[PDB]
Design a protein around this ligand. Structure first.
Ligand SMILES: Oc1ccc(-c2ccsc2-c2ccc(O)cc2F)c(F)c1
Ligand SMILES: Oc1ccc(-c2ccsc2-c2ccc(O)cc2F)c(F)c1
Lengths: 11, 242, 239, 12
């Protein structure tokens, strides 16, 4: 949901 | 878990190898800077640094073992602290100046271009001056920066499984403490000097938290004052503290 | 030269213990349902009386007397709420889930709801108290941590030899902490690990003070709860 | 400047 959330899980 | 099986030297190598690059600013020296342009330069720079910081945190030993929600929480509370200790560190060799970027080197007089930014500038200069007096080493800086990431949000989190998550973080934190002590003994310090320098380094994190708290409030007063537009990621980080 | 640097570790522990302020009481009115104005009144009245004893305790901290008046003022202006909070956290250790503001004023997080924005500060204080509980924080360690806050919190804000003395005293307190841990049977590795764990909590105590200071500032321009001139001056130094 | 804290420290 959050931008930080996406970038953290982004692979 | 691999974090608890790393030696002291392996811990230092992994931290050094994960260091994010030093980013440049879009600073135009011909252009005159108003309040809105400096804070635009700083906001632009900070937003690009946050991307590198996120990918830096994934390479911190133990951080990947945390749940995704725990990773979000730690970065949300520690992000400005990490930006500030990084800024303070790369400014060590420039007394009286803050090196935001290699092309953006500011003194407190230019800090007056933004209202209330002066106080935060002085505290950052004092911290950079303290690092210089202590002759802080690169190996110690990366340790402190990872300590901030793991420590700043640990108190702010319930179950038997969530306790083992805080327990793991404290196991990693202790591993970094062993690493710092390993560094200071390797430099020739005695046991008394080792514990003294460890205390001196960790007491600076108190002042860095204070700067982050103040800087966070100033960013909030900016968001309302509405003059300098914040990036979408920086607004999500700003909302995490309120 | 300063006499505090000549003290041994034992002599430093006993000086800090002997300087401990007393535990004060709150108003004995047992009207149980607290309003926002009534609860903030009790805490403000209590905090103002504790401030007076904090000043006597500061003058008894080894090395504090050797500073100029303005440096003492600066250090206390910067740390007074931190010092109040770590004292509150300490005496709340044996009362899990509660905050012992006074022996006759024991509150839980539900009672923090009576004041807006107070439950967040309670939860942080309760979390610090539980953390002190899980570490089995000893009184001798507590008095060292509190003195460290006094000398450390304002020493990076001495803007324009004196700071060299404060850092020399801080090093003494560190030596005293390690000495306490070696005396308790901890190994060399357990000593520096525990030293680090204790000092990292000070970063959170600083965080709590900053949130608490904003809460007191907003209560000032709410004008609901009158504030003593002493608190107004301590509050005013953070702006 | 006048500060209550000035008086408390001097009369401790
Ligand atoms: O890499 C860095 C960039 C900016 C800062 C900084 C310092 C005071 S405010 C401030 C800042 C942070 C985020 C922002 O969006 C605007 C700012 F002015 C820093 F500490 C590190
Ligand atoms: O001895 C103490 C008295 C009050 C507190 C406290 C805690 C949250 S706000 C708060 C507080 C401080 C000063 C004050 O004037 C009113 C308050 F509610 C404390 F931490 C220790």
């Amino acid at each position: 949901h959050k931008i930080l959330h996406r970038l953290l899980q982004d692979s | 878990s691999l974090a608890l099986s790393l030696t002291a030297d392996q811990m230092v190598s992994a931290l050094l190898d994960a260091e994010p690059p030093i980013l440049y600013s879009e600073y135009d020296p011909t252009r005159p800077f108003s309040e809105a342009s400096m804070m635009g330069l700083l906001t632009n720079l900070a937003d690009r640094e946050l991307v590198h910081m996120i990918n830096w945190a994934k390479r911190v030993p133990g951080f990947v073992d945390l749940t995704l929600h725990d990773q979000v929480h730690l970065l949300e509370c520690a992000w400005l602290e990490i930006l500030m200790i990084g800024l303070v560190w790369r400014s060590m060799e420039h007394p009286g100046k803050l090196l935001f970027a290699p092309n953006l080197l500011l003194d407190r007089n230019q800090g007056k271009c933004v209202e209330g930014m002066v106080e935060i500038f002085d505290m950052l200069l004092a911290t950079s001056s303290r690092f210089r007096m202590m002759n802080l080493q690169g190996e110690e800086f990366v340790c402190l920066k990872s300590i901030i990431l793991l420590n700043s949000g640990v108190y702010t989190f319930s179950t038997l499984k969530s306790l083992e998550e805080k327990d793991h973080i404290h196991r990693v934190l202790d591993k970094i403490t062993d690493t710092l002590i390993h560094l200071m003994a390797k430099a020739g310090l005695t046991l008394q000097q080792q514990h003294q320098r460890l205390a001196q380094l960790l007491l600076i994190l108190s002042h860095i938290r204070h700067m982050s708290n103040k800087g966070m409030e100033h960013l909030y007063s900016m968001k309302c004052k509405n003059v300098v537009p914040l990036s979408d990621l920086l607004l999500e980080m700003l909302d995490a503290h309120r």
